[PDB]
Every structure is written in C-alpha cells, then in structure tokens.
C-alpha cells in the first residue's frame, strides 16, 4: 500500500493524539537490546508529533538478572520486590545507564529530554508480616513542574525511584507507578510496553479492546503479572485516564501502529462510565411526559398522550441517575420483520452534551438486534444530522415500512428520514 | 511497504518540516474539482504536523473562464492581466467562494483557518503603453500580524487581492504574491501548486531538483508560463526562502509524498550561495601559509613547508571571499589509480560553521572524480566524525595505499583512517 | 457646542466603553451605499477606543434583490428564509465582496481586521412541513479563538455562514446569529445596525429605553422583523448580554451619538434582574428583627421593638428570594405632606454588593412618590455617602421636618442628614 | 558575633548574587563522604537566595578507585584521561548513583532540580599518538534550552557525559566542561569545588585574589592539577565569564563563607581588561587639548594652554586604545611631601562609562604613591561625587596645601574640595 494512502489513514489519529499526554511505562528489558534504538526513534517521532510525553521504566528484571547471578534471591510480595540497601544501590545504577543510553540512543537517530526531581516516595512498609525495606510508593508527585516541562515539549524521563523527605531514596513499582503519574497527569493515555502481544482471552486469542469489566474478570482465570496490569489499568481509568493500552514493546514499530491505524496490535483498555437504562414502567410516565412534553409541543416530537405511551410503555427506555429520568427512547416494529425504528428520543437539556443520546441510541439498536431487525429508521424534523453523523444514511417516503409510509403523508412534517444497517 | 516503514520514513522529514514555514501558492483551478477536498485535507493534515501555513490563491484561470464566455477577451502583459473593475468585482466573488468552499471541505475532512488584512497593494500602472488598471502588486504585507497568526497555530487564508490607502482594491498576481509574502516571512519553504507534475528538461524528463542557475538557464527556452514561475522562484530564494517548490496540485497526494519522502514528484529549487574556489596558485602560498601554521603548530595537520607547498601547489584548493582567503583543501595521488586523499583541509576559525568545510571537501571530491578516482582517503587525529558523518568508513592502516601506509608508521601520530567512495 | 465640551462629554462613556465586547449585527443594505464608507470610519473609531468589536452581517436583502429579479420568489418561515444550493451559493459571494469592500473602506479611512471558521452550523430542518434546505443555525461557536482575537485587539468579522462537519455550509440568520455570539462571548453589549430609528411604542414614538419586559409586551402588536429583533434582544438579554441596542444604520454617525451621549438615537434595551419586593406584613417580624438587631446594636440603626414594628408594620418593605428576607426599608412621613424619610435601610451582609441597597431605596422613592412626597429624607452615622454618592445633598438640623428636628436633638446620634427631591 | 550583624554583613553579596548565574564544577569525591549533605544543603540555601544555579561533577577518581582496584591502570594524557568502553560504562553507572543520592541529600535538607540532555560531544580523538578512545570534549551545549530552566529556577545537575550524534556517549573532563558551560552561558561566576584551600603561591601562602595574568605566572611552578583548573579559569575569563573560584569542597560551608562575607576562604580570579596607561609626552598634546578644551570652556576644568601644558607634561597621563586617545589625569605635587592632587581628569563622552575614570585614578593613586603622597586632593566643581562615591572624604579651604589654598582663593571657583588617604 502506497505512502500516500498510509499517511492519510493515520491523519485522524495524529490529530486525536495531538497536544496529548501519553504516560508510557516500560519494561527494562527494552532498554537493552537491539529493541532499544527502534524504541527511542519511535518515541522521538511520537514527540515530533506533537505528543506529550512521560517515560517510566522499570528495574525488576534487571536486578533479579544480578541477584540470582550473586547467589541472592529476590522475594516477591503481591508481586512488590523487596529491595535492600544493595539492591536500590544497584537500581541506582541501572538508572543512570539506562537514562544514559536511551539519551545517546535518542540523539543517534535534537529531541529536549528531561528529567527532574518530581517524585516523593515513602516505603511500603511491611506485608504480611515481611519488611520490603526499600520498596517504595509514591507519597507526592510534583505535577505543576511536570507540566511546566510538557508545556515546554520537554520528554520526561522517570527512573523508577522517588525520595522521602528523610533524605532516603526507595524503589518504586513501575506498572503503578505510571498510572499513578498518569492519574495525577490526568493523561489521556497511559501505555504499558511490555514483552507480551497484549492480554489473551479464556482461549488463547489476544483481547483487542476490553471494558474496564471485561479485564476485571479476565483477571481471575490469570497470571500473576497480567493480574497486577490490570489492577493498574483499571485504577489508572477510574482515577480519571482515558485509555490505557497493553502492547509488545519488542515487536518493531508496534507503538506506532497501535497509535495511528484503525486496527492495533495490542490490548486496549476503556471505561464505560456509570449509565442504568432500563425497561420503562408504569411509574416512569409522568416523568417521560414531563420530559416529551415540552419537546412535543415545539413540533421536534410526535405528540403522544397518557394512553399512547400506558399501551406501549414496553417498547421505552429510560436512562435514570439517583432515580432521577435523564432521559428515554422507543424501538417501534413493523409488519416487515427486518425493521425497527428509534422513536420518541429525547434528553433533559440540562444533563445534554455528555453522550446520554448517544446511549440510548446504542441501547436501542442493542434492543432493535435481539430480536432479528437489520435496518433501524428514525424520522426527524430539526435533529437529522445527529443520525447522519452517527451512522445513518438519508432514505425516501417509499423506502419506509408500508405503514409508517401512511403515517408520514398524512402527518404533514415531512421529517426526514434515514436508516442504518445493524449488524448480526 | 508496511505502515511503520513508510511512517519511519516521514519521521525525519516531519522532523524537518517542524515548526516551520511554508507559503502555498495555490492554482485556482484546484479550488473546484473534486481535487479540492483532497487537498484541503492534505493540508489538514500539515498543519497536523506543526508545520506554519500560509495559503494563497489565484483567479486568472476562473475570470478568464467567465470572460471568454462573457464576450471578453483578457490581455495579458508580461503576464499579467489587465483586470477592471469588472473582473476586480468578479474576483471578489471568487475569493468568497472559494474561501468558503475550502473551509467547509476543511470542516468536513477544528483546524483552525486565519483570514486577514494583511496586505497593502498599489496598482502596476502601466506596461508599454498599457493601462493594466486594477492589476495590483503587494507594497506592505504586515508580517508582524501574520507571524502572530501563525505563533497561534493558525493556518493563513489569502486571497490575491490587497487594499491601498486610498480606499481601492487591486488584483494580486498570485505567483508573485506568494513569493513576495515568502521573502517577507523568510519562510523555509514557498511551494507552487501547478496542474504540472513541475518543470521539464530540454528533452521531456522532469527536473527533480535545480540550482536557481540551472532554473534561470532553463527559462531561455521554456513556456511563458513557466517562465514566470521560474523568475518568482529564483526572486523568492534570493530575497531568503530557503527552497522553492513546483508540485502538480492536481495529482492525488503530491504534496504529502513531496514533503516527506527521500524522493518526491515535483521540481525543485535551491540557491547555490557564493563561494569562488580555485586552484591554488604562486601567490596564495603565505595566506595558507598563515592558516595552516597555527594549525600544524597544535598537531592537528602533518607540517608543511614553503617549499613543500611551493612545489605541490597544484594539489590545492583555496576558498575565497573579498581576495580574502578563508579556507583550503588539497588532493593527494597514489600509485594505485583508484585512490585518492583529502589533506590539509582548514577553515579560518572566524568564517567557521558555515559549510565552508563542506565546500572545500565536496569540490575536491568532484576533482578526485575527474581523474577517475573512486575511494577517497582522510586521516584525522582529532576530527575525525566530521568526516564518519559525512559520508566516510573507518578503515585500518592495512588497507592504504602503500606508499601512504609506510608514512602512516612513521608518522608516530596515529591518525585515523577513513574512505569514501567516490561515484562514478 | 465646542470641541473640548463634545470630548468631555464623551469622556465617560469612552470610559464604561472601554476594554469591552461589542457585537455588531449589521443589516447588509448598509454595506452597499454610501452608507458603507461612513459606518467603516465609525468602526475604525470604535477600534481606536479599545472597543472589542466583533461584527456580522446579513444577505436576505441582497439574496432577494437577486431572486425577485430572477424570477424565483423567496418563502420565509417563522421569518427564516428557504435558502437552496443556488442562494447559498451567492451569499458565498455576497460576503466575499462584502467583506473585501468593507475592508477597502476601512483601509481608506491600519486597523486591524480578521476574519475566522468561527462557526459550525447545523441545517435548521423542518418548519410547518417546510424543508428550509441550506438555512442554518449556530451549533458551535469557537468561543476560546475569539476571545484570542479581541485579546490581540483585531477587529472580528463574520458573514453570515457556518460549516458543518459532513463538509457543508450554511446559510445564517443574521439577527439571531449576532445574539448567539454575544451570549457566547458574554460581550456587554448587542448593536443592531438596521434601517429603522428604533423601536416605536404604541403610538409612534421612539422608544429610548426598554426593559426586556417592556420591550415583550410591544410586540404583541408590531410588525414581523420588529418582533424577532426582540425576541434575540431578549434572548441576549436572559442569556447574560448587559444591553442589547437598535439604531439605524443608514442615519449617519448614529453609532458615535448612541455611544457616547447621555442622550442616544435608538431603542435600549435592559433586564430588569428578579427581585421580589413588597408590603411587610405581620410574619415578617422576626425576620426584620434579626436582621436590624445586629445592626441596631452596632449603633447604624435606630433602636426598634416589637411593638414598634408590629404598630408600623405598613410603613416597611422586605426583599426576598425563595421565602428568604435578604433586605428593609421603610418610609416615614410628617405633617409637611411634601416631605419623607428613607428609614431601616438594611441588607443581609452575605447579600450586600449586588445592588439589593438601591432596589429599595428605588422601591421606596416610587412609594413615597406615589403619596406626592417630593422631598426623601435619610439620616445615618455611619452611612451618609451611600447616600450622597446616589443623588443626595447634604442638610442641616434646621431643614428637617419639625418633629424629627425634635427626635434628632434628643437623639445625642448626631447622624448626618441628607435629602434628595423626587421627581413628579 | 551576633547573628543580626551577620546576616547584614551577607546583606550586600546577597544583592549581588541575585538572579545572577553560578556554574559549580565538583570534584566528585565531594559526592560520597559526610562532605555531601552538608554541600548539597549549602546548594538549597543558594538556591533559596534566587541564584541560578548550574551544577558539574567529575568521576575521574572514582573510575580509578575502580581502576588501580580492578588491576587496570589509568593512562592520563595532557590530563584528560583515556576512557574505554568499560570506564564509559561505570561511568555512566557512577553518575546515576551520584545524581541520585545527591537528589536524596538536597531532598533531605521541594528545591526543584533538572537534568537534560543539553550536550553534545565529540570524542578528543588522538593526542601525541595516543587513542583517547571515549574521552570527550563538547562539541555543543543548548544554551537556550539551560537559560529556560534556569529561568524557571530549576537547580541544573549535569553529569560528566554527553552525547554524538552518531549515538555515542563520551566521558567529558570536568574542569573543563564547567568553564565551557560558562562561557556559553555567559555565568557570572564559574566556581570550581576542589579538595584544596584554593591556590599556594610561590611560598606557601594561599593566593586570596589574582588577575588572569598573575595565575598564569603561578602556574610555570605549579603541580599538573592547579596547572589545569589556571588554563580553564583563564579560558572562562576570557571567554567572558566574570570572576572563577576555587575553593576546598570539603570544607564545611567553605561556599556560603566564600560568596556572603567581605574576605572569603579561597582563590578568586579576574581579568584585568586592556588599558594602556603611560606617561603623556610632547605628542598628546594636541589631542589632551582637544580633548580638554570643551570642559574647560564649560567651567568643568581649569583653563590650561599649550605652554602649561607643554612645561608639565611630565605629571599627566594618558589612556589609550589603538593610538586613539580616549582619557588623560595629571598628579600635581606641593611642599608638603605627604600632599598631592589628582588634576585634570576627563574621559571623552563617547568613551565614558566603561571605568576608564576610574583607571586613570587608580593609576594616578599608584604614582601617587610610589613617590611617598598619603594624602590626594581633587577639587571639583560640579563632579564632587565622583569622588565622594570612591573614597574621598569632603575638606575645608584651610587643609589644603597653602599654595593650591592661595590659588583655590584666587580662583573665584569655589570648587568643592576631597581627599583620600593613599596607604602605604
Ligand atoms: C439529539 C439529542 C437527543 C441528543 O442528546 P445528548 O445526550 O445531548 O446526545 P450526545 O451528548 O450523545 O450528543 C450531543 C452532541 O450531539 C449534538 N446535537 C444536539 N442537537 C443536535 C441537532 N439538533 N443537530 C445536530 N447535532 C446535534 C450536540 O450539538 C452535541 O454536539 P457535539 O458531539 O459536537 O458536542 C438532543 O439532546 C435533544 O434531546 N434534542 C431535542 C430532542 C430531539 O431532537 N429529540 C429527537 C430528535 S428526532
Ligand atoms: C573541520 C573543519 C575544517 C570544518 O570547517 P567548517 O567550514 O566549519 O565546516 P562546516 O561549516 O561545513 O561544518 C561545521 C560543522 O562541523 C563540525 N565540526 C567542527 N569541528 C569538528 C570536529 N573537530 N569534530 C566533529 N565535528 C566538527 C562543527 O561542530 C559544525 O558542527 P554543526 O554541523 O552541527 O554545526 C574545521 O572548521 C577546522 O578547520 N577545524 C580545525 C582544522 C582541522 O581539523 N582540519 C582538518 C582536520 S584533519
Ligand atoms: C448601605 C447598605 C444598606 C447597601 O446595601 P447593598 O445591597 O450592598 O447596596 P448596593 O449593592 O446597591 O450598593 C453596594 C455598594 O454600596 C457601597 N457601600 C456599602 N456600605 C457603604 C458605606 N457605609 N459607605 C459608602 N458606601 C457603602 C458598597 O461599598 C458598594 O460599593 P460599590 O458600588 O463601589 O461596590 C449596606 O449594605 C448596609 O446594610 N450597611 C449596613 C446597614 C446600614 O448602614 N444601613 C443603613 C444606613 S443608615
Ligand atoms: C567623571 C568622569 C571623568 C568619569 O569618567 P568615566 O570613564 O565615565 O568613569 P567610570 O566609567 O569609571 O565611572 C562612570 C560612572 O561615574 C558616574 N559619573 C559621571 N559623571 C558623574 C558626575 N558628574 N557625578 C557623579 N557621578 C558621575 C557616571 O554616572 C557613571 O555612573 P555609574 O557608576 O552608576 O554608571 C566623567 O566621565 C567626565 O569626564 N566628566 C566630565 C569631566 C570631569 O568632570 N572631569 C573632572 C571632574 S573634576
Ligand atoms: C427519532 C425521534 O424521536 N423522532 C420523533 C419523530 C419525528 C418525526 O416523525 O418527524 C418521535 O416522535 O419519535
Ligand atoms: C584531512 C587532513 O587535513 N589531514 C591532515 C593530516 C592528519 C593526519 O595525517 O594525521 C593533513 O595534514 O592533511
Ligand atoms: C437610613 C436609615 O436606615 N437610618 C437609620 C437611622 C440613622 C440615624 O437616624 O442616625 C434608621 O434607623 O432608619
Ligand atoms: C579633578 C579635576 O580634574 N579638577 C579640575 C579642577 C576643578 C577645580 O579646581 O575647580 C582640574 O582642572 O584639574
């Protein structure tokens, strides 16, 4: 395929990642091989683009590498190493010459690299009864002087050790220490590069893009490490994170085509924000007549009645916060078995603007497609572009069902309307 | 070719073409088509990239197109056309369509779009008799409001038609409004969007890249038209823009495929700046005597000596300026007919750093070739990476010449070696 | 009138003017005549007093001008006219010459002008059955690129168009469009620049000064296009604008003479902001008393009573929101029946600052109007500017109805006194 | 002493520390004992005093520790010491664990601290036959991008290693990357934190204050180490930076004692710019006199005259650059052998400014002196302060010389009369 037509395809996604903050946590495997100098071009285009970044590598593998090989070995505990006085001596090490080589790895293929005394850990302290010495958390995390420093398009580097105010210095976990300076970045995006194409379903096959949920309970049936990504994950997304991605950062080149092209190469991570809708009632009526009533008198809803709406409450949706109605929507059905239409779609103005139609909407054709119906109508005098931008082709008076066709010549609206093909 | 190749092939063009400026002259004819929408969309994605934009448009084509099916016949003088208040009125009419369509195709395809007052034009007068009317040429261009646009991020929407203190507006060439707006940004680059895949040698080829002299010499022979490119071409750079470009807007993608491959599809312009060298002569001796001894007194150049120099001045090249002598350069033979060395290069330290070095090496190289040489030889025992970044190996004593390598021994200096090969 | 009396005069309202947003909703007849060159000075002027400026205009007028004299005959609806493929495709040019015209005129007579993608519309749809095609409405407004223009001190043009993101353009009400942008930019002040001196009461003279409520009830009985001028005059009103004007346009320096003078040459147009005032009554009490008792013991207040109150209970006002006493005041009269007395004035001191005071004070000279009381009275220790600061002189013991000459002697307050002559 | 009379004492080098720029070059043993807290904490304080500061560390004698103890042994060379791919690597490792515990130590004792990648280096290549291998040099520093962080007040750390741009990492010598990094950043002050009491002189004594030139000639009897840190003090003066310090690091407070009181503990040095001062002789006078004549035409000198002139150009002196003439000053003696005057003092406008007065008196004070006068006279009319400002107390009539108080009598002049006590 040519340059032209792959440059034009990852056009959105360079204008969604724009401007961006991307929180990368990198395991310390990367920053060693050949897959190093692959990695940092990635990231100086990354930058070239536009992208805010914060880079966050991990020492584990690294240490465990020294100590099995001086006879020591490493106790885990809930995955957290202890870490004694050599050992963080050590992590010391490996910081400098890893910052040191990723620099020179960097400039060998012009791009401002920071790094800065943003971090304050405190010791983790003991668990289950085992003193993890030096293992730290992070206690505070200098934000403003972060990003005073994305603001500048600096790249931050961050080692994987913070300090205490007692003038000691503590190892810090690297898959929570990102998403813990993600939260408080409040990035839109934090990466997990890993040595794993992404995380694998029940049988084998590797989740592309996963609910908050669906990783929650992939969890139980999983290892170990996958099991404390996702933990991390989920904690960096409900503290505010929009996306968080898994992906194999030894694979060439999968930081860039996870990024900019419709399909990926990895696993990603979304939180479903809090939305109850369910089957309308008989107690909802007064509510959704509020609610419709006023709609239904500008002429933008078809006028409906307490006895229209008691007769047909099954074929409503509402959409409910604190037991309070936010909003509604009804799937109508016809004599032709393949179609459906959006009715009477409708939310509150004062909790518009944050995706409540759009749920509806989905939730109805949800509702359209278990029960075989392919083609979903909606008709509409003054909101027709909503459907045209969100999937809807327009369609003429002798496209609609045979009855609905009667109903809209003798209206006198002449909405407009369109459909969409759902999928089985 | 896979995503990530061709995306890693950008990556240093994006690097280049970051921050920095570009004036678009744009046909008109490429406001209409279906050739529009590309287009726009292509220039989206620049301005994506943190590239500064500034675009401007013609109407000759589009008045003509209304004038010969109007009655009207245009005259053209030197090219440009006689324009009334007629077509003046009509092309007031071009721009806000235009404008306008270019927006809504931009819209569909929160890029930000900047127009302005930013130019001042008086009318031409008049040419050989010729009352050209309301043809207009720019008189002030107010840069410090544009540069604030751009500092914005905003992309600049021009169209070719000032305003003069006395309260009448003129009709801006296009072609040489963008090139006078060029100078004045000191953009990097000026880039004319033709219906021509860019200008042809005397024999059908298209010319890749040109000096501005080769331009010029082209133009003797060459179509009005392209003519008068060449001339806004060869003014643009001379008044600083750095490189002119000529691109077929018509063709699909040109400008990405332009702009960021190591190849391209269009013409392109760049000017060859002043440097005179020549072959050393009797009377350069104590100039390069004077250079060379600071030089050869800290060991960073083998000792030479009057008569040394006196009887081999002909291996030498010297670098000008003013009868001032700011560099040389000389070439050294072997018995082995394909070899070849640079020596004695220097460049005075106060006219350092501005591709004086380069200069002296490159013409040497074309000396080297002429005489059918084919590896090029430079031994450096503190500048060596001047020659490993431009374009030389690292080679052992045991691949000299032999001749070379007996004084290398001897030397006791332990210079590094390093080759290049010359092509043919 | 001299020079030095007309500028100092102006001074003030140069003042209020000052660093505030001006939309202009101009009607586009305006742009054409000779109108056109004194209306683009004004404008200059404007700009020179630091008078944010955005400005928009209107094509109905033209478009007809053009359609009535095609053939073709424009329907409006709701006053909103059906613009198709072929009207929207010459308000395109209408505002690019417009647009350029404008400029010329304000070049003729430095001033820097700018001009944006401002806009996304979305089509209005339906009315009454009526497909309205190409007539737009405002849907987004990019607020944050305005307020960075104004803040660069440009002036802001808009014609009347948005795009959409499907890639199409609209074709915008003038008069609603302005106040959508004016609530946007939450600008001061709302000018629209029409044909007409104003808006005429019921009986053909000009209407000064307007509340938004004043204004709602002329319409009842006026014409078409003056009902929708105060429909968005009312709606900029709600929607946060601080005064909505209409002038006339074509009559010339209007605009200059609205702004600067005590007196003006349009309709204005202000909200009256909710404040529920009345006659206290019995269940008050406790209320007034604690709010006067701090107060009355601070000494700022005479010393009342129960009995005092309960036997007085009608000479007293109370402010009040959602059942909460926020304010008081009470007019006590005398055997001179031209004389009165502001007595008890109090705000609550969470609520002071917003004018509660004056709409008391206000409240109270209409009552003590209404019984042909021509002289108000208010004495006070601590608080006599307040009162000299709004419309009070100065007076002695001697001036005082006899009575409260009595009471003020044996007082041993000393309070100063100050009167001010209501108006019959 | 009392800590109010301290810290009044520091009062004046604090004034003058201010939002100046400090760069500290430091031997790195500082960085490992006791030493470090205590210099770490010296570094907050300036920090808090609003000095910008940028920091440099060594590791030569930590390699070698590894060294000599590794069974390897250090070649050195002019100094600067030949570093394999093996010392690189410590080296590299080294700084992390420096970075980071001085981090800890300043973090232990919210002081915002910033490491970058601001150099590049190139390696120093062969000195006399010998492969230095990675020993670096700078090849460039990104001055803009250090002036933005200490803009901001970040505290800059930077390692003794930079990167090429063919993507390797060199090992930079110390001492004279400080002084390089001065002279880019034109820093004030270049201090150089040693193991020593700053400089001996030819006999033991610490040398408190030397010129450019007298280290230079300390340095023909001096140890190869203070030889090194004279040249790169001498470079950094040169190259523009203000003053250089050496002082014994290891010296508790050694820095505060150095820069906030009026003595100090250390060397410090300062270069003498060039002013050639001799003794005028018959060819200036023409010149003193053109020079001379304005001011004693505005009443600013006494009138003189070729004869005057001509018969005492022996007591004048005359300031010089490039032949040109630019100053002059005369010592006038008495019967008093202890009294002397500085007499006819005058820079010319154009050259004014700069502290040629002030060398020109400093010069006449030093004749003054060598010939036994404690006590010199200016008279001055409307130029008092001048001297006041520079250590002249105010006189009466009756002090003067009897002679020069006879003609001061006869004069009708009034001048104001000073002296200062001239110290043997
Ligand atoms: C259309 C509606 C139901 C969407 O509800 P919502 O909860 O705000 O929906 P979402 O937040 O998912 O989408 C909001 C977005 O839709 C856009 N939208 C709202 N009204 C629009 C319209 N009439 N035309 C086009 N787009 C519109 C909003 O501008 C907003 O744009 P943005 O994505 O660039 O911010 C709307 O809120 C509504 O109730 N309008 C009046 C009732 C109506 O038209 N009902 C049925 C139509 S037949
Ligand atoms: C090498 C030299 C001749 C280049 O001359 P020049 O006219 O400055 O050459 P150019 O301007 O084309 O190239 C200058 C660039 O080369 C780089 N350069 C200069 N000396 C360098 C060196 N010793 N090592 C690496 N790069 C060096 C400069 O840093 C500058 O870097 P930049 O491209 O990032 O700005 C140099 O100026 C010189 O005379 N040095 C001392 C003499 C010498 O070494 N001569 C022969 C070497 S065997
Ligand atoms: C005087 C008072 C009743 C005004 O109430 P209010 O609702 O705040 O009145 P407004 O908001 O219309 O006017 C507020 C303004 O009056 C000014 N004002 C308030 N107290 C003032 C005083 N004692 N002297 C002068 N001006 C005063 C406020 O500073 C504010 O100034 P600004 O216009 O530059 O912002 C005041 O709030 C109050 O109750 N003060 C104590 C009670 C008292 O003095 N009552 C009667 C006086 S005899
Ligand atoms: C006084 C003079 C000789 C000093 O020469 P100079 O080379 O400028 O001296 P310096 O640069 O060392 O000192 C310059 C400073 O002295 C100050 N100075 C100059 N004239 C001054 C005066 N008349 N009173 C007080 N200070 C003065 C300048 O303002 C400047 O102030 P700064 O230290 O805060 O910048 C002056 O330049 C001069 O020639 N003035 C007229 C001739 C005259 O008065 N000669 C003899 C006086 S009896
Ligand atoms: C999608 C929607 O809510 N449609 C409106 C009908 C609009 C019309 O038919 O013209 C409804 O009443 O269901
Ligand atoms: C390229 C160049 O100028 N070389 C130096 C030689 C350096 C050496 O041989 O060690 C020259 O004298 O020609
Ligand atoms: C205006 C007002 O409220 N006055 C105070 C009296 C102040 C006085 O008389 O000194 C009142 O009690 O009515
Ligand atoms: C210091 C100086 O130059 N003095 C002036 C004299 C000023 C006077 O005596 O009043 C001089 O002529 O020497």
Same mark, same amino acid.
């Given at each position: 395929?040519?340059?032209?037509?792959?440059?034009?395809?990852?056009?959105?996604?360079?204008?969604?990642?724009?401007?961006?903050?991307?929180?990368?946590?990198?395991?310390? !495997?990367?920053?060693?091989? *050949?897959?190093?100098?692959?990695?940092?071009?990635?990231?100086?285009?990354?930058?070239?683009?536009?992208?805010?970044?914060?880079?966050?590598?991990?020492?584990?593998?690294?240490?465990?590498?020294?100590?099995?090989?001086?006879?020591?070995?490493?106790?885990?505990?809930?995955?957290?190493?202890?870490?004694?006085?050599?050992?963080?001596?050590?992590?010391?090490?490996?910081?400098?010459?890893?910052?040191?080589?990723?620099?020179?790895?960097?400039?060998?293929?012009?791009?401002?690299?920071?790094?800065?005394?943003?971090?304050?850990?405190?010791?983790?302290?003991?668990?289950?009864?085992?003193?993890?010495?030096?293992?730290?958390?992070?206690?505070?995390?200098?934000?403003?002087?972060?990003?005073?420093?994305?603001?500048? *398009?600096?790249?931050?580097?961050?080692?994987?050790?913070?300090?205490?105010?007692?003038?000691?210095?503590? $190892?810090?976990?690297?898959?929570?220490?990102?998403?813990?300076?993600?939260?408080?970045?409040?990035?839109?995006?934090?990466?997990?590069?890993?040595?794993?194409?992404?995380?694998?379903?029940?049988?084998?096959?590797?989740?592309?893009?996963?609910?908050?949920?669906?990783?929650?309970?992939?969890?139980?049936?999983?290892?170990?490490?996958?099991?404390?990504?996702?933990?991390?994950?989920?904690?960096?997304?409900?503290?505010?994170?929009?996306?968080?991605?898994?992906? $194999?950062?030894?694979?060439?080149?999968?930081?860039?085509?996870?990024?900019?092209? !419709?399909?990926?190469?990895?696993?990603?991570?979304?939180?479903?924000?809090?939305?109850?809708?369910?089957?309308?009632?008989?107690?909802?009526?007064?509510?959704?007549?509020?609610?419709?009533?006023?709609?239904?008198?500008?002429?933008?809803?078809?006028?409906?009645?307490?006895?229209?709406?008691? $007769?047909?409450?099954?074929?409503?949706?509402?959409?409910?916060?604190?037991?309070?109605?936010?909003?509604?929507?009804?799937?109508?059905?016809?004599?032709?078995?393949?179609?459906?239409?959006?009715?009477?779609?409708?939310?509150?103005?004062?909790?518009?603007?944050?995706?409540?139609?759009?749920?509806?909407?989905?939730?109805?054709?949800?509702?359209? !497609?278990?029960?075989?119906?392919?083609?979903?109508?909606?008709?509409?005098?003054?909101?027709?572009?909503?459907?045209?931008?969100? *999937?809807?082709?327009?369609?003429?008076?002798?496209?609609?069902?045979?009855?609905?066709?009667?109903?809209?010549?003798?209206?006198?609206?002449?909405?407009?309307?369109?459909?969409? !093909?759902?999928?089985?």
């Amino acid at each position: 395929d040519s340059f032209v037509a792959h440059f034009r395809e990852a056009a959105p996604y360079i204008r969604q990642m724009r401007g961006t903050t991307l929180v990368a946590g990198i395991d310390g !495997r990367l920053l060693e091989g *050949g897959t190093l100098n692959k990695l940092a071009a990635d990231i100086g285009l990354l930058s070239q683009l536009g992208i805010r970044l914060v880079l966050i590598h991990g020492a584990y593998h690294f240490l465990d590498r020294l100590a099995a090989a001086q006879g020591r070995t490493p106790h885990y505990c809930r995955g957290l190493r202890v870490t004694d006085e050599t050992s963080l001596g050590q992590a010391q090490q490996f910081a400098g010459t890893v910052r040191s080589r990723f620099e020179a790895a960097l400039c060998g293929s012009s791009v401002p690299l920071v790094s800065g005394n943003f971090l304050t850990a405190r010791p983790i302290g003991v668990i289950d009864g085992t003193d993890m010495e030096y293992a730290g958390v992070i206690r505070k995390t200098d934000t403003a002087a972060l990003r005073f420093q994305l603001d500048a *398009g600096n790249i931050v580097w961050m080692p994987p050790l913070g300090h205490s105010y007692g003038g000691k210095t503590f $190892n810090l976990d690297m898959v929570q220490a990102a998403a813990s300076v993600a939260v408080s970045l409040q990035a839109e995006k934090l990466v997990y590069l890993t040595l794993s194409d992404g995380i694998s379903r029940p049988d084998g096959t590797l989740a592309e893009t996963l609910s908050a949920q669906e990783a929650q309970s992939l969890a139980e049936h999983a290892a170990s490490e996958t099991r404390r990504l996702i933990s991390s994950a989920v904690a960096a997304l409900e503290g505010g994170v929009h996306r968080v991605q898994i992906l $194999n950062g030894a694979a060439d080149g999968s930081l860039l085509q996870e990024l900019f092209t !419709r399909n990926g190469i990895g696993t990603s991570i979304a939180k479903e924000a809090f939305v109850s809708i369910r089957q309308a009632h008989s107690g909802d009526i007064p509510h959704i007549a509020a609610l419709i009533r006023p709609l239904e008198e500008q002429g933008i809803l078809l006028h409906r009645s307490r006895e229209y709406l008691e $007769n047909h409450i099954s074929e409503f949706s509402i959409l409910e916060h604190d037991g309070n109605l936010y909003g509604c929507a009804a799937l109508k059905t016809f004599a032709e078995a393949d179609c459906g239409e959006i009715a009477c779609l409708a939310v509150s103005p004062q909790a518009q603007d944050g995706g409540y139609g759009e749920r509806l909407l989905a939730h109805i054709i949800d509702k359209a !497609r278990g029960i075989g119906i392919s083609r979903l109508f909606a008709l509409s005098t003054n909101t027709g572009e909503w459907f045209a931008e969100r *999937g809807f082709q327009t369609a003429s008076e002798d496209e609609l069902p045979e009855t609905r066709r009667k109903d809209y010549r003798s209206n006198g609206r002449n909405s407009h309307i369109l459909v969409r !093909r759902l999928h089985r």
